[PDB]
Design a binder for this molecule. Structure first.
Ligand code: SF4
Ligand SMILES: [Zn+2]
Ligand SMILES: [Zn+2]
Ligand SMILES: [Zn+2]
Lengths: 732, 433, 385
């Protein structure tokens, strides 16, 4: 049951956390210090619950947010697999399925090395179940999808795989025995005992990626770092719509008509046999691997699509419905570009004036979009991809709009002119994204190492039996140095009151507080800016005015790019440029997606400097409806979460460098807003012993010697740090 | 080899008399003198501000790139050279525009005046380096693809083609993105300029020793803060075992040295009937006898008045108070007998000891018949005549007088002998053909 | 706020047990602040005839004060003491003073044992600018190529004085691990008030011991920790042969004053540029020059002088320990077995074998100056066999 050595008295602090949340079917919220193996804590009891079957049943789904750390989950549990294996004697059967679908896909050297995921998987599925489903037999057009054919033969066969694999395993096994990740995974979902994949993949309302069978008997799912659920769920149902998309769609309108015109009865009587079968008994014909290729369920919590074949009986008639839609939709676009308008169910009502038959052909469209292409089975998917966007949209507008939100954003965001207007359909109820989750599941446990206010689980608007505060001791001398700055000499203004471009007199001493941090602190630092143009504003005075003149002389600097390609470059450098004779401080952005998937080690990356209040500051009026609805839920929330949204991202970013429990961390706080907000947002285990013991308005020049005093002592021989042997009560 | 013998006049003064007194050749001079300092003494001109410069100067290349309109050309590296010592294809580009800017001094300003500020599009040569660095980053792009682990460019891409989104997350900039078009253009180039300066490590990391493993992710990464690996393991009884046997040998042979043994047991044998204890009986009797004799101190009142034993005690005092007849003035020809041998023969003799130590060295292994090289077995023969002849006229120059000569030649014949010892001992191990 | 809060730090410190006996326990805590790490020795195996390499970071880190007016002033002054106390303890060794300054490395004093040469070098090293950045790669280059030509029967250890800065040197010093791991050369650094992970990985990949400077007292401790010849890695050597026993010469043996001075450019010996009158004599060159218990340049063997250097470590290993009791077994007439006094600060120091009563000033005098209990004498040598 892997105590395996001194475990820094925590597994016992989490032992009863399982036994309360699982034996009593507790939903459950865990605080966890960033300095704790996210699974060595959790899975060691979870895999212990896998062996300890209660009445009978113990499922496992797990998810996280980044596919390298997904494999890092897998990585040491293989020894945990091996650990008790020798100890309990023999070895029982196991499976953990890393199912990163859209990522690793085809071994074939022609399909494979085209860069993006979705379009190339469209080439794959167009080849498999659109070319070799339409043109079944053949020699050259059939090509060579041997791995899918191997799966079809293996469907009759019953193998038994080994343990949990990776995305590089099925790749090398593609030339050996594996029949490719997509289907070997379908056969392994049949008897899966543990699934790990992305937090995103489950939470796709666009294509409803139903992972298991809907079996809520004991559906046992585990959650780590589940911080920005809104930024998942609302963005999971967020619908962007380009004018350039529509005109391309306008161009393949009559393009598809030419396919209709050239086909007289060949694909048309193919429809006629089965469109009659659509009327007689309803059954999907694209339910092979095309169910996950097409919009599985845009609006999942519905009863059924009972009266399919909506007010539309023919195909060009159905095509005219989109002519009735799109051409009206640009009429619902182009005039509307003068005023931002937030009217979600009023739009569909005014649409009902314009659309002749509504609310059934709005909801029964995206399949009849697809199915009238399914009798074709011709059009390449990336060509058809901006169209599937559209029949997704009014389908979403058809069903869930009165609780949800329509926003129209034509004006200046990377367009200085009006050259690309856009609108968006957001949802608002991440609850209603996670209510079907909860109804499909048993009672499933969030763990977030950043979540200090427990009051934000009712921002998820849900119920909780178990929600406490995890308190761990530190006989490791001192876990960390949290250091709120508040300079008095250079007069702290670190919140953007006079904003990131309103004055540079604020900015005259962020270099000073950094270079001295650079001068003292060795061994690589990853700091967090607010945004890319903020970052662009950050270094804007830094070149022309004299700033780097000692900064490059002390360590070096790793610019992270708006483009993720060049952003991954310095990364290749930073893991190297620290581990050689160079400190090489990396420079980065909190809210940007450079802040996940890393888990910095004492090897490289052991200090973080705050820069400003880490709040949104960018997207207009996505607030107000989201604001007023929680004001329709709890009514004093303007002040409230608009603190915590910064805070939930802060230690999400900031509290990352410390792992194990001796790994160090210098998480200083250059901030103007600290009085309650930083204190509310910091962990109750972390405000208590460490944050502002007697160090609040710590001018950097004074705070210089703090880290000096910190490290020099803390780099002395560590004879023993909270050594546990046998069980001696202690009772916390 | 010749700049070595000219910049150093002391070693040249050593190198003179092998040509002046014709001791050895230059071929023999660089055959057995240097041989080690070819790595040690030549370790100055090669390093020179750490060559294979990757992460030493690169910290200071940007702050020390400009003092003034002509603040350049310090020494060798001064402030321009290691800039050239990193860029290679860009060094070919420098060579391309030196005639474009005519004067090299003009090039030093022009080629670096506009590239320093924002952007350099005035000359083909400046544009050559400018366009190349975009290709360099394009070239640097391909190398980062080959590593491809712990790189969330992979991990980010899986979440954006899937809904066809995160193009709005790019296109969502606040704060007046309408009418400037200045620093938007500028800063990304400075972003690009310092990423060049960042990849200038990468542009010089290949210079190190080509530095390649490119990271196939090594899928273990076992978080080992625990475990107690405890890297060093001494104390498996190594000097415990020495102490058990050497003090045992210091027990059974306690100081078998010069006076340390031979006087020791000889007087222990003189103790004689000590196991018989008849001497020890009389001892313990004499322990009991003068037991009382000390404490009374009437016998030890007058254990002083023997002026009979003062005169002799005064005598060897006075005898050692005046030693006489031992050449009080022992020097006073030594100044002449210093400056004449310490003009050449201090260095001349040193010509031998740079060689004769190696002459001891090849014979220090020769009967094993391993270090038996033709380079060495005739180097036995080579300097043998090259030294023992060239001393004979320095020997014969000082036998101008007789007792002025015969004192110092008692001490020089070791040089003749340690030569002939080696030669004499050479055939004690008779070498075959 | 802070005008009170600056003096809330004084409120508790100044105040104590009031009424009577004030500012008393504050002095007791200062004595309770004392008594830091004692010895924790007891080792075996290796440590013999070291060949040390002083490596000095000369950088801009020296300009910070932090202990002294210069960090070299903290460094350089006690190195002379470290030199002398080394030559006190370990004369069978020699030390390479090598200085890094401006991204290069200058082997300042060669690998040798002549103290005055080393100390005046430090006295020359006073007015050093320490311009430029540290480069260890040039330092290891000298360290390789010099010790490359040393025998494998030599102890191969390197003492680096690093000012905790960026290790500013190219050319794959991470690959110098396998260079020097194979070369069986140990490398020990201590960081000046901070840590370098790569250098910390270097020493933990070495077997050399790394530390961080805490204070000037603490600076002395690790020097003192590295005075002792440490048990380095196994399979270095066993023996070292042709240890030349010399002769002193009086130059008055048979022929009284037949030579005005025994250094006239022809005599066997007379190595260094100075006049001499005959004091010494080596076996193999038969080298007569100024007396030196080290080695020579023509016989090239080791001028061993046994009572000095074959005596120094010869009792530096075989130590034992005492014990402490606060009790009162009043052995003597409330006395000490050594100095014969009493204060009774409950540290009645009893030997492990002969079990004799000592004080701190008798324990320190053993454990720093006498290095053995003489109570074992009269107790070992009488039944010894
Ligand atoms: S099915 Fe398996 S092989 Fe065939 S395309 Fe998709 S990956 Fe490439
Ligand atoms: Zn000799
Ligand atoms: Zn005592
Ligand atoms: Zn004793």
């Amino acid at each position: 049951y892997f105590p395996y050595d001194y475990i820094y008295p925590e597994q016992f602090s989490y032992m009863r956390e399982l036994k309360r949340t699982l034996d009593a079917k507790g939903h459950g919220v865990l605080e966890m210090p960033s300095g704790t193996g996210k699974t060595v804590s959790l899975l060691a009891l979870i895999m212990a619950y896998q062996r300890a079957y209660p009445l009978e049943v113990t499922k496992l789904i797990y998810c996280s947010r980044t596919v390298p750390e997904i494999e890092k989950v897998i990585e040491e549990l293989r020894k945990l697999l091996n650990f008790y294996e020798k100890q309990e004697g023999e070895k029982l059967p196991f499976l953990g399925l890393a199912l990163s679908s859209r990522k690793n896909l085809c071994i074939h050297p022609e399909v494979t090395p085209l860069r993006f995921g979705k379009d190339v998987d469209g080439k794959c599925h167009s080849l498999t179940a659109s070319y070799v489903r339409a043109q079944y037999q053949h020699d050259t057009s059939l090509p060579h999808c041997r791995f899918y054919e191997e799966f079809d033969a293996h469907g009759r066969e019953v193998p038994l795989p080994a343990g949990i694999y990776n995305l590089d395993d099925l790749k090398a096994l593609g030339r050996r025995q594996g029949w490719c990740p997509y289907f070997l995974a379908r056969y392994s979902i049949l008897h899966a005992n543990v699934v790990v994949y992305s937090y995103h993949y489950l939470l796709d309302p666009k294509i409803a990626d139903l992972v298991s069978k809907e079996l809520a008997r004991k559906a046992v799912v585990v959650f780590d770092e589940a911080h920005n659920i809104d930024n998942v769920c609302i963005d999971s149902m967020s619908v962007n719509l380009t004018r350039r998309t529509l005109d391309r769609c306008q161009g393949n309108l009559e393009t598809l008509q030419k396919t209709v015109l050239r086909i007289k009865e060949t694909d048309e009587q193919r429809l006629r046999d089965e469109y009659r079968r659509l009327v007689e008994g309803l059954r999907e014909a694209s339910a092979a691997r095309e169910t996950d290729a097409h919009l599985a369920n845009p609006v999942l919590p519905d009863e059924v699509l009972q009266e399919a074949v909506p007010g539309s009986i023919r195909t060009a008639e159905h095509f005219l419905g989109f002519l009735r839609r799109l051409l009206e939709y640009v009429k619902w676009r182009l005039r509307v570009q003068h005023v931002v308008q937030e009217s979600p169910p009023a739009f569909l009502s005014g649409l009902a004036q314009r659309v002749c038959i509504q609310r059934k052909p709005l909801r029964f469209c995206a399949e009849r979009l697809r199915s009238l292409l399914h009798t074709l089975e011709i059009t390449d998917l990336a060509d058809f991809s901006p169209l599937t966007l559209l029949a997704n949209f009014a389908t979403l507008v058809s069903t869930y709009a009165k609780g949800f939100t329509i926003i129209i954003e034509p004006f200046d965001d990377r367009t200085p002119t009006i050259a690309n207007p856009i609108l968006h359909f957001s949802c608002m109820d991440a609850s209603l994204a996670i209510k079907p989750v909860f109804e499909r599941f048993q009672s499933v446990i969030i763990t977030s190492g950043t979540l200090s206010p427990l009051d934000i689980y009712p921002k998820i608007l849900d119920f909780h039996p178990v929600t406490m505060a995890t308190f761990t001791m530190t006989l490791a001398r001192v876990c960390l140095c949290p250091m709120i700055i508040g300079r008095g000499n250079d007069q702290v203004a670190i919140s953007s009151k006079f904003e990131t471009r309103e004055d540079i007199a604020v900015i005259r001493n962020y270099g000073n507080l950094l270079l001295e941090m650079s001068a003292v602190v060795p061994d690589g630092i990853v700091a967090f800016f607010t945004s890319y143009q903020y970052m662009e504003s950050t270094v804007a005075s830094w070149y022309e005015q004299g700033i780097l003149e000692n900064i490059q002389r002390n360590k070096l600097l790793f610019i992270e790019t708006q483009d993720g390609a060049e952003t991954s470059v310095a990364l290749e450098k930073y893991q190297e440029a620290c581990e050689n004779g160079r400190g090489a401080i990396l420079l980065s952005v909190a809210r940007g997606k450079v802040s996940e998937g890393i888990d910095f080690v004492h090897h490289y990356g052991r200090a973080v400097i705050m820069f400003g209040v880490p709040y949104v500051y960018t997207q207009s009026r996505i607030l107000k409806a989201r604001l007023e609805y929680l004001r329709d839920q709890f009514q004093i929330r303007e002040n409230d979460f608009l603190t915590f949204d910064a805070m939930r991202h802060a230690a999400q970013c900031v509290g990352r460098a410390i792992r194990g429990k001796t790994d160090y961390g210098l998480m200083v706080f250059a901030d103007k807003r600290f009085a309650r907000g930083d204190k509310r947002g910091k962990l109750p285990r972390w405000i208590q012993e460490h944050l502002t013991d007697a160090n609040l308005n710590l001018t950097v020049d004074e705070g210089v010697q703090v880290a000096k005093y910190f490290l020099r002592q803390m780099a002395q021989p560590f004879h023993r740090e909270d050594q546990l042997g046998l069980s001696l009560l202690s009772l916390e | 080899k010749n700049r070595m013998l000219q910049e150093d006049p002391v070693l040249f003064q050593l190198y003179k008399d092998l040509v002046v007194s014709q001791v050895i050749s230059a071929e023999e001079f660089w055959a057995n003198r240097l041989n080690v300092n070819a790595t040690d003494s030549s370790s100055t001109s090669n390093h020179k501000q750490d060559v294979g410069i990757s992460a030493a100067f690169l910290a200071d290349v940007r702050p020390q790139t400009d003092g003034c309109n002509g603040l350049r050309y310090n020494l060798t590296s001064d402030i321009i050279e290691s800039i050239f010592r990193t860029y290679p294809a860009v060094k070919m580009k420098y060579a391309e525009n030196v005639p474009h800017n005519m004067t090299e001094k003009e090039f030093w300003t022009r080629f670096f005046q506009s590239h320093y500020f924002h952007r350099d599009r005035l000359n083909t040569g400046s544009k050559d380096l400018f366009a190349e660095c975009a290709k360099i980053d394009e070239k640097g792009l391909k190398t980062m693809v080959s590593l491809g682990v712990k790189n969330p460019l992979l991990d980010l891409t899986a979440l954006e083609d899937k809904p066809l989104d995160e193009g709005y997350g790019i296109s969502s900039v606040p704060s007046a993105s309408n009418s400037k078009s200045i620093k938007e253009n500028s800063n990304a180039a400075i972003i690009k300029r310092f990423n060049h300066h960042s990849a200038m490590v990468l542009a010089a990391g290949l210079r190190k020793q080509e530095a390649q493993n490119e990271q196939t992710s090594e899928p273990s990464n076992m978080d080992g803060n625990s475990g107690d690996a405890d890297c060093f393991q001494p104390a498996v009884k190594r000097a415990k075992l020495q102490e058990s046997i050497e003090y045992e040998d210091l027990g059974k042979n306690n100081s078998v040295k010069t006076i340390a043994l031979n006087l020791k047991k000889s007087d222990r044998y003189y103790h004689g009937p000590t196991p018989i204890q008849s001497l020890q009986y009389a001892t313990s009797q004499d322990i009991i006898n003068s037991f009382q004799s000390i404490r009374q101190e009437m016998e030890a009142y007058t254990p002083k008045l023997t002026q009979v034993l003062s005169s002799s005690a005064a005598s060897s005092t006075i005898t050692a108070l005046s030693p006489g007849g031992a050449l009080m003035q022992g020097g006073t020809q030594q100044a002449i007998n210093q400056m004449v041998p310490n003009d050449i023969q201090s260095e001349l003799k040193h010509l031998y000891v740079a060689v004769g130590e190696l002459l001891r060295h090849f014979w220090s292994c020769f009967p094993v018949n391993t270090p038996f090289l033709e380079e060495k077995v005739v180097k036995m023969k080579s300097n043998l005549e090259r030294f023992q002849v060239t001393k004979l006229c320095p020997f014969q120059e000082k036998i101008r007088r007789q007792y002025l000569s015969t004192n110092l030649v008692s001490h020089i014949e070791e040089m003749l002998q340690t030569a002939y010892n080696k030669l004499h001992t050479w055939q004690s191990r008779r070498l075959m053909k | 706020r802070w005008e009170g809060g600056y003096e809330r730090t004084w409120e508790i410190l100044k105040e104590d047990e009031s009424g009577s006996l004030k500012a008393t326990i504050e002095d007791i805590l200062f004595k309770a602040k004392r008594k830091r790490v004692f010895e924790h020795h007891g080792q075996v195996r290796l440590g013999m005839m070291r060949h040390l390499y002083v490596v000095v970071d000369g950088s801009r880190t020296m300009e910070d004060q932090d202990l002294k007016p210069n960090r070299l002033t903290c460094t350089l002054k006690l190195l002379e003491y470290f030199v002398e106390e080394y030559f006190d303890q370990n004369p069978i060794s020699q030390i390479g003073i090598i200085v890094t300054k401006s991204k290069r490395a200058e082997k300042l004093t060669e690998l040798s044992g002549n103290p005055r040469k080393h100390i005046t070098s430090l006295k020359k090293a006073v007015d050093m600018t320490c311009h430029g950045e540290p480069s260890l790669y040039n330092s290891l280059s000298i360290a390789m190529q010099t010790l490359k030509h040393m025998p494998g029967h030599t102890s191969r250890e390197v003492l680096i004085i690093f000012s905790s800065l960026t290790t500013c040197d190219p050319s794959n010093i991470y690959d110098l691990i396998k260079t020097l791991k194979a070369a069986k050369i140990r490398v020990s650094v201590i960081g000046l008030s901070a840590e370098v992970r790569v250098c910390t990985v270097l020493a933990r990949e070495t077997g050399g011991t790394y530390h961080v400077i805490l204070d000037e007292s603490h600076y002395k401790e690790l020097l003192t920790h590295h005075v002792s010849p440490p048990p380095a890695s196994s399979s270095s050597e066993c023996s070292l042969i042709r240890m030349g026993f010399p002769q002193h010469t009086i130059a008055s043996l048979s022929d009284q004053d037949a030579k005005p001075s025994f250094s006239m450019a022809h005599l066997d010996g007379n190595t260094e540029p100075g006049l001499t009158l005959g004091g010494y004599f080596c076996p193999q060159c038969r080298a007569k020059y100024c007396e030196l218990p080290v080695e020579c340049k023509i016989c090239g063997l080791t001028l061993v002088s046994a009572p000095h250097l074959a005596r120094s470590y010869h009792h530096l290993f075989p130590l034992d320990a005492f014990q402490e009791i606060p009790l009162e077994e009043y052995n003597g007439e409330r006395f000490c077995y050594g100095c014969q006094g009493e204060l009774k600060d409950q540290h009645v120091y009893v030997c492990a074998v002969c079990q004799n009563v000592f004080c701190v000033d008798c324990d320190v005098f053993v454990h720093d100056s006498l290095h053995c209990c003489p109570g074992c004498i009269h107790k070992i040598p009488a039944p010894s066999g």
